[PDB]
Swiss-Prot record, chains B, D:
It comes from Homo sapiens (Human). Disulfide bonds join 10-94, 12-126. This is Calcium homeostasis modulator protein 2. GO terms for biological process: ATP export; calcium ion import; positive regulation of apoptotic process; regulation of microglial cell activation; regulation of synaptic plasticity. Homo-undecamer. Two undecameric hemichannels can assemble in a head-to-head manner to form a gap junction. The gene is CALHM2. The chain holds residues 37 to 305 of 323 of the full protein. GO terms for molecular function: monoatomic cation channel activity.
UniProtKB/Swiss-Prot annotation, chains F, G:
GO terms for molecular function: monoatomic cation channel activity. This is Calcium homeostasis modulator protein 4. Signal peptide: none annotated. Its main location: membrane. It comes from Homo sapiens. Residues 1-10, 68-88, 193-263 are cytoplasmic.
Amino acid sequence: ELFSVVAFHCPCSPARNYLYGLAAIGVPALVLFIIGIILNNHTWNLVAECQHRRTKNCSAAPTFLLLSSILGRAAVAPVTWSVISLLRGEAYVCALSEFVDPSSLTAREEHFPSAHATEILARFPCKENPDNLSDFREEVSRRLRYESQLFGWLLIGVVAILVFLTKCLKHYCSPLSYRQEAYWAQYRANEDQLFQRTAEVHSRVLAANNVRRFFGFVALNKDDEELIANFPVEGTQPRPQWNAITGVYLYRENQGLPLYSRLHKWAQGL
Amino acid sequence: ELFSVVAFHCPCSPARNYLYGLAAIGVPALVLFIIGIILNNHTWNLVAECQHRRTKNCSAAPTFLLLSSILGRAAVAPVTWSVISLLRGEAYVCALSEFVDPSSLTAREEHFPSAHATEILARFPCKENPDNLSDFREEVSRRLRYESQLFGWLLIGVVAILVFLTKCLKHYCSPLSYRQEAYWAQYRANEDQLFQRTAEVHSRVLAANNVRRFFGFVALNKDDEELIANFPVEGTQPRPQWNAITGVYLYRENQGLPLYSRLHKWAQG
Amino acid sequence: SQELFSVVAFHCPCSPARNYLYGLAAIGVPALVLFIIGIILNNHTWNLVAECQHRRTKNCSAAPTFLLLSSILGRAAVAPVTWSVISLLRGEAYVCALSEFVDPSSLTAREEHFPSAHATEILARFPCKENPDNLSDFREEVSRRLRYESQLFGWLLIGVVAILVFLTKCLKHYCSPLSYRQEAYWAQYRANEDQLFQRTAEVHSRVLAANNVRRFFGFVALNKDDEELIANFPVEGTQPRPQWNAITGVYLYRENQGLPLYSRLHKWAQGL
Amino acid sequence: ELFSVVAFHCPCSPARNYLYGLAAIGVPALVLFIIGIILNNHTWNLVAECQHRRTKNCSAAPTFLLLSSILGRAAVAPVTWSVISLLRGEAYVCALSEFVDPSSLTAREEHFPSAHATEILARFPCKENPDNLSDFREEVSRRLRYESQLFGWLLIGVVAILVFLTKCLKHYCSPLSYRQEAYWAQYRANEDQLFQRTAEVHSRVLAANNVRRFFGFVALNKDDEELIANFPVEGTQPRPQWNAITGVYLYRENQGLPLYSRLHKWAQG
Amino acid sequence: KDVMIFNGLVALGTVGSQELFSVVAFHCPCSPARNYLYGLAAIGVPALVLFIIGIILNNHTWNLVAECQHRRTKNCSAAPTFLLLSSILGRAAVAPVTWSVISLLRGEAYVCALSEFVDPSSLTAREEHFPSAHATEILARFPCKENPDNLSDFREEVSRRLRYESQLFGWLLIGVVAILVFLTKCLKHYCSPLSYRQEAYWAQYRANEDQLFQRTAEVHSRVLAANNVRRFFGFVALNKDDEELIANFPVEGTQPRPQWNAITGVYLYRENQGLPLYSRLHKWAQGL
Amino acid sequence: LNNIVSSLQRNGIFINSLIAALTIGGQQLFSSSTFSCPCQVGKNFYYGSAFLVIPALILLVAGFALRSQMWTITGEYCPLECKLACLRFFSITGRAVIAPLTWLAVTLLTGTYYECAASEFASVDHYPMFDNVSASKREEILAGFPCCRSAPSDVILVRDEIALLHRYQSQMLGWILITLATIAALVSCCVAKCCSPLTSLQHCYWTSHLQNERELFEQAAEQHSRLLMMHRIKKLFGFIPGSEDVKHIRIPSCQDWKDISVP
Amino acid sequence: LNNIVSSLQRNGIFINSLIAALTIGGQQLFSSSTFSCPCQVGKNFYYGSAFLVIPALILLVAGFALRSQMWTITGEYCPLECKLACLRFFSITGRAVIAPLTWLAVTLLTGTYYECAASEFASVDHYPMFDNVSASKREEILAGFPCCRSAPSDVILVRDEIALLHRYQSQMLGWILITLATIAALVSCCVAKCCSPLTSLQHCYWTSHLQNERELFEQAAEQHSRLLMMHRIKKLFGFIPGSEDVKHIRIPSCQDWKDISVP
């Protein structure tokens, strides 16, 4: 019942629930937004870019074209949570039930009291309303839910246009045809998955090369014995060599031919 | 349950629900429509055509045949969602509840109050009406649902006629016998399968040849060894070479023998 | 286990100046117990201790200790937080703690029918439902404001952690001289060495046990798979304590001849 | 079932139940404590060590740390049963029911009789109280149950710190790096498993020779002959040699090389 | 181990039987000076009996008798007697104790016992209301649960105070047996001449030899009988397994009568010039 | 798997436990079905007493008789041979007498049989209610209430007390009998471990040898009879049955059937 | 597995127990279905008595007749041969008579048959209620109440007592019979272990040999008949059936069918 713990509980109190409405919708949005940045590898080679130069000589022209991608590939997660809450309507109705104008209620005559209008309107989300106002609550509850469900649908539309706008500009302003970018897209993932796979193996071989020197032998599984018998190592990769394959790469052509990753630029010996 | 999330909940209010119903059906259609353009590769190369020339050399009339294809193919998503909502009728009745004329109401004598008309009619879809008007509530509910379904059945009828006119004229005015077009339509959908398939293989092979020069070897599975052994790579293809196989292509013939795709045109030098 | 869960479940004692002591214990102590478990299992805390033991002079400065000490708590302070947060979101712990501190005049939803004879006593009885029926509206009112005050803090606590984690992660990559990518290999090396070490320690343990039993019983009984172990992995003796003493201790990237060494063991494997 | 028999039954009687609470808790703790000592192997060679010296030749200080291991390992059962009883609270309320000060009672106006304060306060846990004081029976029970749970949580906290304190100092004060203790611990477990495994094989072979010598043959299962053939016995092993590989053992070095057990010391000759 | 599971099944067996017994057949005779004897017999009689089948079914018991009858001098050393006596009790005397404690723990056995002895003047919460002549008789009817509701107030305290005594008494019994087992184990190891690894090896050997002895003895009976069948018919019909035994096991013949007597009785554990002997059977083979 | 069951069947304790459980179940079924406790004043002790003794006696006789070896023991009866006969007789008796002991114990523990049995023997002079100057109706009602007659005339409570008393006594007897039985077993075992000349291991081996040779000789006798009959057929009909008969056939006449009718 | 069942089938005790259980079940079904206890004053003892005896007699005759070997025993009847015949007759009788004994015992234990049987024989002169100066209505009502007629005229309690008395007697008879039966068995066994010249093991071996040789000779006779018929066909049709017939065929004429009609 982990989902049962994070379930919404509207605190019916004036000037108080909309804070809770914010902090029970914004915070999971902020958590989801942060996770998107942290797990996105394109944000670390950005940080390591300004780290190693220590001067920030590079201007904002190459940064902004990448910086949007950092948020874009990550900002989807908050939106698909922000929109879901609005569609459910629970988040908005409890947030704004205090602000309903006591002169804008319909479907009933002038039966709304004026002693504590904000207080009595604040308790509508909790259904703790006297039966003489049940018409009023089912009017405010359905009206506010509209406003949320209207905003949620509108928000989906705005993303539905920004994505199409971006996907057009990213293909109209870039100097490469899309069929070549798909290759360049199919190369970044093809290399990275090979790199991670080959990093683990060259780690294990180096490890088994040290434990042996400490025990005289190394315990390895039957399939792991193939690894040592196939991929011998002579040492370690120097730090400056490790420092030339970290960072941001922007389509540097070489002698009339293209290079698709910063590693590739080093592969030719550049 | 995502069904409960995207459920159509009618806000019974005057001058308010039709605005909601407009944005509760049209917007998903817009999203469905946007998806169709984005995924359809026939629109990127049309965009890619506009970027390389930078001058608008190509005339609009030759491109209108392809321009109608992207909109036409993607038009299923709005229609298959606009129609389904109309036939269900929930979207329309909540939208047009407040426009029903009280004087033209039937099935009952002239006892309909007129002090606040739109307020009562707006509340019909939510069933929040006194039972003294239940006959009126049901009568408007059925009549409004009738117009939705009649509009819905009209909508599907119009699309079917449009498809019939489209396909009949497309085959009539095309300069190739329809049997050849089937072979052609069995080519572009066949090249793109091979071209995608070798795109990865000539990528992964180029991936391995880069890691190996760095680490000193490359981890591979049993199948991947065949990729490196059978298909060796030497370098990369020039950027202008990539530029010659992207865009639109309209049956340019060579010497009297057809070229079916722009890549095939480049394959003859 | 329905019986085990029932034992640990919260039982709020409705009494003044008493429940918030229990509320402190019913959450703080399980947090403290979880935190202690976090320290012990963290292998980095032991070679930290062993570093403070072998040198006997406090050779390392604050900076080498500070950088590691952050990892000790970070890999371990998760457990208390995911327990403290889960408690606050439930709200039962908080409402029991502060049920005797709401100001009676701040109450609403009812006129000044709130008795002032012994305010703290009647307020403290709210969480256990032990309230007069005439104040059931007040009981719910406090039962919601205090639930809110817990829940807002529970969500607020998660937000603060979600900033520190991002701030800590960003600062480490910007401050460490290594590229982020080389750290991934370094992380991928400590795990491989440790797993191979522990697995291969067992085998070099069993062989020594097998060798010693043979001298006593006159022979040794092995399973089908253990028979290969004796022949494939023969040993000649043991390893001196100083040799065991050069591989237990915090290691921070001593480069050699321009080529990195990734752990104490690796430095020893080069005889440096 | 078993739980029904050993189910706590509070004797509602003054000056009497707290005796029952002690026995219904201490005795289960005392019994479980004994099993901890009895099953533990490190306690017998400790006793067996006193057998051979018989004169306290070895100092008590080096052997103290083993005594810390025997109590620590065994104490899990009494604590995990003492804690459970405290958290349940049944033991404590019946233990301290009759000691609640009537003056400090609250949640009710002063209707508490003083004719038999202890007696009526003794009968509270067993529902044998006047209903006019039923609120008191809830008030006293809740306060007492509060005290039990606080002690339970404090106790588990102190055990939590002591486990850490005795594990922080043990690594600090031991003369070996913690990794050597990792090998040493993995060696001890391996030795005992292999040592016990050979005992079955050595006995079964030795018994075969004696039975063979007296029936003229032996009846064997499928793998017994393999045991007989592969592992023949040439005799037995002298008692004093066995005595050299029994008893406690401290880390002692030989020619700059460690010896992890007496059996290792014996095997080195 | 094998010993613990063997004891565990017996402990479960009596507890279930005790639960079964306490349901079908236990009716406290509410008659003065009759339940008291009935209560005592409701505990001791199953206890004394269950101890008896423990002695009879123990194979080692007759081994003690055989040596005692053969030697007529009790020449058996203290240590082997310590082994056997602490073996039979640890294997047999467990059952009565488990029955004894659970009977006390449930309390229905004891509540009958001291119901006679309950002091009418010791009652509290009200003035003592019992005639000087029928006070004993009315108390004897308390356990039957047929007492009038007027006497129900006084009955519950009495039926619980004794039930308090039973559970407290039952727990105290557990303490004594638990302490004794701990005390005996230390005495067993302290007074033994050989370390526990030797004791483990020896007791582990004793099971293996006797298990080997039993299997061989049954086979030796079959092969000896089969050979006599051949002598009496001139031919023998055997299945696959038994026919292999006769071809693989030659018949040594009949062992001398003293040889059989030499392999029964108690073990003197006389080291053969420093070489240990772990049973009489082992000594006989190494002796000749 | 079935070999394990046969191995446990060889365990005498298991078979005796099975016998005891079966006897207890049969006794319970018999009591719940066909007891009815006849309530006649004249001879009611007879019915209960017979229910107690006759089933025990018939079970004892059945246990003694169902063992075939006791017939051979008696035939030998009608040095070491006497000792061996005594040992075998004691061992067989044990299983012969376990079941009736179980029946008596369970019947006494239940108490119904003793309740209806000695009911008219109750002492009523202590109770002042039973005056009965007639001195005959007293015995009538005394035998009348225990069976099914409540007779709600204040006597019911009295009768329950009487019932209780008898029931109490019944329980004691059962346990008393149990005690004696166990004691007997012990001393009986003493004899089997005092007068026995063979060793404790010698006795078990000898018994296994006896069972093995009995089964072996029975199999050999069956096989010898089979071979003799085979020989009779191969001498009469001229061929061995079960083999290739296509060689020769005697075709016996009418006189030949008479010869094989001798045995 | 089925071999074990056949092995237990060879156990005579098991088959006799099966017979007893089947007879008890059949008796219970017959009593619950088709008894009805006719209530006529004139001849009611006849019905119950016949229900007691005729089923027992027919079961006894069936048990005696269903054993084929007793026919051979009688044919031999109509030295050692006499002793062997006596032993076989006793052994077969045991199983022949077990079932009717079971029927009688279960019927008496149930008591209904005896209840309806000797009901009119009850003694009523002791009871002062039954004066019946007519002396005929007394017997009529005496036979009338036990079957189904309650006749609630104060006599019901009396009738129950009478019923009880008869029922009590019935039980005794059953057990009495049981006792006698067991005693008979014992002394009968004595004869089988006193007049028998063969050893106790000799008798069982000899019986196994007899059964083996009987089955073997039956199989041999069947095989000899099969071979004779095979020879008849291979001499008439000229070929052996079941073998390669493609060699020769006799093609017999009309006269050839007459020759094979002889046997």
